[PDB]
Design an enzyme around this catalytic site. Sequence first.
Site, PDB file in Angstrom:
ATOM      1  N   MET A   1      -0.283 -15.052   0.690  1.00  0.00           N
ATOM      2  CA  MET A   1      -1.056 -14.213   1.360  1.00  0.00           C
ATOM      3  C   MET A   1      -0.591 -12.802   1.541  1.00  0.00           C
ATOM      4  O   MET A   1       0.420 -12.493   1.484  1.00  0.00           O
ATOM      5  CB  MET A   1      -0.963 -14.911   2.898  1.00  0.00           C
ATOM      6  CG  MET A   1      -1.627 -16.156   3.160  1.00  0.00           C
ATOM      7  SD  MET A   1      -1.196 -16.591   4.895  1.00  0.00           S
ATOM      8  CE  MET A   1      -2.495 -17.879   4.958  1.00  0.00           C
ATOM      9  N   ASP A   2      -1.551 -11.986   1.188  1.00  0.00           N
ATOM     10  CA  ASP A   2      -1.264 -10.414   1.292  1.00  0.00           C
ATOM     11  C   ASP A   2      -1.458  -9.653   2.410  1.00  0.00           C
ATOM     12  O   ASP A   2      -1.416 -10.627   3.523  1.00  0.00           O
ATOM     13  CB  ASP A   2      -2.331  -9.787  -0.008  1.00  0.00           C
ATOM     14  CG  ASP A   2      -3.734  -9.775   0.426  1.00  0.00           C
ATOM     15  OD1 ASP A   2      -4.045  -9.414   1.297  1.00  0.00           O
ATOM     16  OD2 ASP A   2      -4.306 -10.607  -0.306  1.00  0.00           O
ATOM     17  N   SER A   3      -1.459  -8.573   2.448  1.00  0.00           N
ATOM     18  CA  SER A   3      -1.597  -7.819   3.813  1.00  0.00           C
ATOM     19  C   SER A   3      -2.573  -8.447   4.476  1.00  0.00           C
ATOM     20  O   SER A   3      -2.522  -8.942   5.682  1.00  0.00           O
ATOM     21  CB  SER A   3      -1.908  -6.371   3.463  1.00  0.00           C
ATOM     22  OG  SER A   3      -0.718  -5.804   2.752  1.00  0.00           O
TER      23      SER A   3
END
Lengths: 192, 78, 117, 93, 183, 70, 155, 75, 80, 108, 105, 60
Positions: free
Chosen positions: D39-41
């Site tokens: 998961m990114d930002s």
Amino acid sequence: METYELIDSDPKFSRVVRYFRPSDYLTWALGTIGAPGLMVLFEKIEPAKGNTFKMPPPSIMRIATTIGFFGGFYYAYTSSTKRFWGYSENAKEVAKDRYEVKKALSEKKSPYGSSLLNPYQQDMSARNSTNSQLLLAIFPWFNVANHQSHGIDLRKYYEVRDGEENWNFTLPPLDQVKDLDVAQYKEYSNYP
Amino acid sequence: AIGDYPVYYKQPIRWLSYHAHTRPHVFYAIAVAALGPVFMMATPLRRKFLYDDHEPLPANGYPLPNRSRDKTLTGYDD
Amino acid sequence: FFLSEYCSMVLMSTLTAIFFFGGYLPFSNTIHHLILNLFDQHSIYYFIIEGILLSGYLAIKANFFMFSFVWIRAAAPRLRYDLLILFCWYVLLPIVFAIVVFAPGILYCFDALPVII
Amino acid sequence: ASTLTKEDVLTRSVSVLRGFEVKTKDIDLQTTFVQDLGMDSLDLNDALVALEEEFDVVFDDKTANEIKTVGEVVDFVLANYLPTEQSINHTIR
Amino acid sequence: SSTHTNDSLNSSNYVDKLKDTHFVFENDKLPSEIPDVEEVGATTAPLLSAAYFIGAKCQDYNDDFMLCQKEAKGNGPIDCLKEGRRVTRCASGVLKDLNTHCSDEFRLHWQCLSFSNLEYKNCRKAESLLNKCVFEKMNLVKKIPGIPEDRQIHLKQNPVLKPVALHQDSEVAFKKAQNENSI
Amino acid sequence: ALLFLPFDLEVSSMLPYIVSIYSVGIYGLIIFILFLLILIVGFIYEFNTKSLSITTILHKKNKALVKNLY
Amino acid sequence: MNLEILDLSILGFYSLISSNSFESIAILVATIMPVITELWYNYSQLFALLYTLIYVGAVVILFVFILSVINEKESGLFILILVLLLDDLDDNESNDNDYNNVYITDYADWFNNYNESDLSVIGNLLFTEYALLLLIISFILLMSIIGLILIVKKD
Amino acid sequence: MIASLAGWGLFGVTVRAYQQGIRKVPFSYYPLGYVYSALGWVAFGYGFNLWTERNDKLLEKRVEKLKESRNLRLS
Amino acid sequence: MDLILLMLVAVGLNIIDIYIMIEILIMGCTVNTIYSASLDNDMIGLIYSLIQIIIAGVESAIGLSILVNYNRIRNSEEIE
Amino acid sequence: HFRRLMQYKKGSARPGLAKYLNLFSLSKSQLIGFPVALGAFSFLSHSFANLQEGQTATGEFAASSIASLIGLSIFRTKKPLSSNVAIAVGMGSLFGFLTWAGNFNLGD
Amino acid sequence: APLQQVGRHGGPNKCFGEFQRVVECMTNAKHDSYEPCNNLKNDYLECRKHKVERYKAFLMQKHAEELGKDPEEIGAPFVRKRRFLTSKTLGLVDGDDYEIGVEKI
Amino acid sequence: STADLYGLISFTPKRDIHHYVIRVDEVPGKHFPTNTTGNFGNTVDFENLEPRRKPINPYL
Ligand SMILES: CCCCCCCCCCCCCCCCCC(=O)OC[C@H](COP(=O)(O)OCCN)OC(=O)CCCCCCCCCCCCCCCCC
Ligand SMILES: CCCCCCCCCCCCCCCCCC(=O)OC[C@H](COP(=O)(O)OCCN)OC(=O)CCCCCCCCCCCCCCCCC
Ligand SMILES: CCCCCCCCCCCCCCCCCC(=O)OC[C@H](COP(=O)(O)OCCN)OC(=O)CCCCCCCCCCCCCCCCC
Ligand SMILES: CCCCCCCCCCCC(=O)OC[C@H](COP(=O)(O)OCC[N+](C)(C)C)OC(=O)CCCCCCCCCCC
Ligand SMILES: CCCCCCCCCCCC(=O)OC[C@H](COP(=O)(O)OCC[N+](C)(C)C)OC(=O)CCCCCCCCCCC
């Protein structure tokens, strides 16, 4: 029991204050200045603030005197009342009461006095104020009216006791004294 | 003493004037209510100098004569 | 609701005339008797005119306050709300609680305690 | 009182996590967020906000850049769970 | 006063409905051994007009009836029936006398009272005519006990409380006798 | 609003004295004045504490600027 | 056909289905009005008015005063009807059958030539005969005035 | 009665002594507190022995009326 | 059907609802007193009723004063 | 039981009403267990009184234990019988002691 | 001693006279016990409620049934509506059954 | 003597509906606020009143 002569089962306010013995004013004198003193003594026993003696504010010394004044009066008022009921020594008072009642009868005036109250209200004002002093500690109430339910037999003021023959009083029969039950209902038995 | 609050046990007259200028709703309310007891206590002056009280109203039923029944009463018979 | 508001204005105008301005009582009894002197008391026409006079006497008095309700509205600005509560409690109540004791004192002092006849 | 325990947070946490695109369906305390779930930002914020909607606990700005594992969030809820104040009707009657 | 009681007709038929009130007649009469008497048949206005004249003529008989009640010790209705007829017969005497001697002045008075809410203060003019006519035919003088003679209310020349509406017949009869009798 | 309930019961309890001001005579009048003087102390108490005033404490605060030379 | 019964049957229904504080307040008024009206007829007219001047005029508009400062948030029909119908079967608060189903009368007397209102007698007794009751009640009202301030006034 | 009053006076002293143990101070602290306590509890002592002596005169008189009542039952 | 405590269902579910029920209950004792005073033709009972109305009035004020202070307590944060 | 059922539906989201209604929440068996026990107590008490020409501690002890056991075996089924017998014997002694002491007062 | 049973006009009501004789009987010094005043107390409660008298009416209503007597011929005739106290019912010789005026005195 | 004293005091004289203390020291109704003589039912005459029941003070 230490009973005495029953002067007036419901003494009037003006008569209770009149019969204050010199000791009774002294009691009132102590209570009026005792209350400021007791506030001072309390600071002596333990100060309100800090660990050192500090005289309470002058404002408090004024209110405490007022509490003592209205507090010390009742101790005098109760002391005088017990002499009327017969609970306290009343040899001095019996002499004074009999002289005034005899003077009232001699002048063809009621012992109790004229009243602004119709015969029912006199009876009503008797029940409200009689024995009210037994609660005078809790809240005040006084017999300020000229009613007639004083729980006595007026013929006890007719016979002459020791040391009274010198006053040279002449007393008419009760049916001719103004403002009495026996001398009021002469026309209608419903109205005075 | 340019505008000092008067002391009630030192300047009774000036203490009244302070509450008559700055609190009108309190001073003149008591004064109107003060006339109530003042006029009530002035009644014994009226009972001797203006007029005497009325007789009490006959609100105790039919006034019953303070006597005994009259035996000789006759007439209006059957 | 609007009809409710104005009935109070009529009622409170009438009540003021009833309590302080004598209600239906005539302004002058001399004029009142002169007008009623013209109508025979044995004909119902007398009692029609009598009702008109007494009601008209109440109406004129009640009119002046109904006029006064509009009169005050056209000459006085609105009063801040917080000063309304501080008004009656601090000012009107002590005065109305003082005349409630001033009245019995005077009536009793001159021996004029009222009765219902 | 705070009726949430550690297991209760952990059990219900997976269901929210099972509701978002996760590289593996095996998630426990040791599982990470950025690494394991990829998961990114923006992706991670939705899950973190979602746990705020279920656990009813607000995450501050200090912890924002300091979140690295899913066990921390589960333990965080216990330290920061309170029941909302009930009105005078609910409490005493 | 006007409080709902169980003895006389109350304010409205709804009050009678809530209480399920029944107005009950009795068809019997007094038992034969109790002597019969003719009840007074005057209504409110005639009696209020003649209340003082009934008192003057029946003063000895009112007192005996009320004294009998006191001496009956709660048994008044049975032990003062014989005295009760004396008061009724004397009262009927005055109403009959006022009807054959002062009939004109009598009706003028109580018709004024019916016109002005039965209040004694609203019919002074119709009363002064009746008092003068009664004193010249029955020797009955109205008196209010308890106060001096010169303080009785009906002799006040300028009463503070006057009727709002003047009775016409009272004014006409007063002025008719204003110059004729009171020259 | 809360203080309306006492003072309204006071006024509405003076009704018996209105219809009987005569018969009770002076005795009722003296009782009546006492029945108010007790309630005046309630009136006096609310007057001093300024309980009726809406009051403005949340705002309207000022201070005097003072130099702090070092 | 006493229509007083129907009104209470309605009030006996909205009391069971009352949900929020609006309904409960309206129960108080809907209880006072059958009290006031049934007293205006029947027993005592003076106290039918004394209810309105004090109950509604002092307390009930103080009920709705505080209620606006409190909160405003948020079996079936056959059971409520069944409860009412069984509750309505017996309505004789007393069980003296002779005293309930037999009527009486009183005999008027002309002795009280001084007719006066029931309030005048109450004043003639409350201010003279039972003055202590009056003076204690004044003392209680004094306590409330000081009592109500200390509870509410934060400072 | 000096025999009885001395007893209360000692009892008043002991209260002051027991007070010091409560306050955790040496018993020789402000010795006047012992005199004040002794005078105070003598004053209660004088008003107590009167109350007991007064009771005896009341109780015996009530007893006499009770023995007569008992003799009526015992008959 | 009162021995099953049916009246508890008729009470609302707030503290203000309990206050109402008490005043209704006290009002039941006054209506009974006025019933007793009038039938007996007694004005002593009507004095009692007047006292019940006055006394029950004060109790209403004290109850709401406590409730208002109690309700203010929850919303007594006053941060701004 | 029905009256409290009606209260649950007046308000259930409130914990307080549900909390205290659980205290007074009689079970289904307790609705039969108690009227059976209280009924059986009164039948057994009088029945033993007639033979004994007057209530005694023994008669009340016998009735109170048997009335409890009959009652207990209804709403205390999920317990060993030995536990129920001891409770039934235990509650018998409270009433026997109460009757030996002479109810609440000796009277004459 | 405080007043009880005061009528609506300020005087004794119906049942005060029976109340006074109870107080006089109880407080009198001549009575050894309160046995004499048992009938006096029974009369006071009779005055207020008439319960014994109402019982005697219940029997008379009940007994009139068992002999077949009809209340029309034994009972007291009554009128139930206050506007229908007609002059014909009142017995006036010339009276007619029209409704009487009870709208406003 | 100590036993005999406690025997007297601890005795409780029986009170029933016949004998008990009533602290009523007069008769009501002598004067009413208005209409003193009502239905003439007040038979008790206060001119010829029999002596009342005086309380027995045991300490006197
Ligand atoms: C002049 C009469 C006007 C009547 C208007 C209301 C008529 C409906 C019947 C109410 C009267 C029955 C007695 C019970 C008191 C009211 C309690 C109540 O629950 O009212 C319900 C009312 C109608 O709403 P509903 O849909 O039926 O109920 C669910 C609402 N969510 O919803 C409400 O909460 C009422 C909203 C208005 C409240 C106004 C104050 C109440 C009425 C006071 C005057 C009526 C006096 C009582 C008359 C009947 C006496 C039995
Ligand atoms: C159409 C009809 C409509 C009627 C409306 C009411 C319907 C019935 C509702 C339930 C009724 C139960 C109560 C019955 C009335 C109260 C008891 C009573 O008054 O006695 C009646 C009945 C028998 O009495 P009886 O022997 O005939 O008296 C004659 C004396 N000459 O006495 C009895 O023996 C009844 C049995 C009661 C004993 C068992 C119940 C008590 C134990 C459980 C109580 C509940 C918990 C309470 C706890 C108290 C709190 C400390
Ligand atoms: C449904 C019928 C309702 C009957 C109610 C009767 C009202 C009066 C009761 C008297 C005692 C007052 C107690 C306060 C009310 C009782 C509350 C209640 O009954 O709830 C039951 C309560 C909780 O039970 P729980 O097991 O925790 O919850 C079950 C959920 N399924 O369990 C309890 O703790 C209640 C028992 C309290 C203890 C009472 C003991 C009193 C003394 C009894 C023994 C006598 C002592 C002397 C014995 C020898 C001398 C004879
Ligand atoms: C003359 C006859 C009357 C007797 C006096 C009665 C009141 C006492 C006032 C004295 C002054 C005072 O209290 O002075 C203060 C002293 C000492 O205080 P401390 O504890 O050392 O604190 C420190 C004080 N320094 C800093 C001075 C050291 O306190 C006492 O003495 C406490 C005695 C308790 C009261 C005893 C009376 C009990 C009566 C019981 C009736 C039921
Ligand atoms: C560190 C310290 C720890 C404690 C140490 C022990 C201290 C011992 C003190 C001895 C005192 C002493 O000797 O008192 C003796 C005196 C004198 O007795 P009397 O008046 O002749 O009575 C005669 C007694 N007969 C008949 C038994 C002989 O009585 C007292 O004062 C009584 C003490 C007070 C009792 C408490 C109740 C009083 C108030 C009532 C409240 C309901």
